[PDB]
Amino acid sequence: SMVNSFSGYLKLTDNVYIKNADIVEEAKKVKPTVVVNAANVYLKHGGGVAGALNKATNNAMQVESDDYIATNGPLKVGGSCVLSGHNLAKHCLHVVGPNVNKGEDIQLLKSAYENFNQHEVLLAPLLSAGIFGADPIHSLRVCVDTVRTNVYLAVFDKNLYDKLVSSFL
Ligand SMILES: Nc1ncnc2c1ncn2[C@@H]1O[C@H](COP(=O)(O)OP(=O)(O)OC[C@H]2O[C@H](O)[C@H](O)[C@@H]2O)[C@@H](O)[C@H]1O
DSSP states (O other): OOOOOOOSOEEOSSSEEEEESOHHHHHHHHOOSEEEEEEOTTOOOOSHHHHHHHHHTTTHHHHHHHHHHHHHOOOOTTOEEEEEOTTTOSEEEEEEOOOGGGTOOTTHHHHHHHGGGGSSEEEEOOTTSSTTOOOHHHHHHHHHHHOOSEEEEEEOOHHHHHHHTTSOO
């Protein structure tokens, strides 16, 4: 197994680590095999993690995503696809958490995190915890209870990070 340069992560469990950092800056520094995007089913990378990752690729992520959708159609809620990581990572795993704010079942967050188990090591965000409206601590707990591979979580928001790391899992 390869060794990556992830540094400054707090250990949560045997396989889950967390840091107060911007996922774009972590990806630029570490250049991991897999960075995870918190996507929507259309791969329209507007804001949050998706918009920030896409901007850092100079829109190449969006161009590639548009071809993916034209060929294959939307992803499923809880689903994923593997695309290029462009200048940020070898690959980007686009994963769709439920849009809880629009009535999608929060239970699909477990299905979303199951996609991570197909990859030995990932740099990832907390799925559904932003504009999709899932409680962030719930997303973290589902991640810890679902993902068995090595996941390095980048939490942009300082106040959120401080709360998450002093919560039970
Ligand atoms: N640069 C960042 N680095 C790390 N974490 C971040 C960053 N930006 C936001 N977060 C945190 O990452 C977490 C997830 O926030 P979100 O990115 O909204 O993802 P979702 O799954 O809820 O919504 C998906 C939609 O978001 C996009 O618009 C897509 O195109 C989709 O339409 C929150 O805790 C954020 O504070």
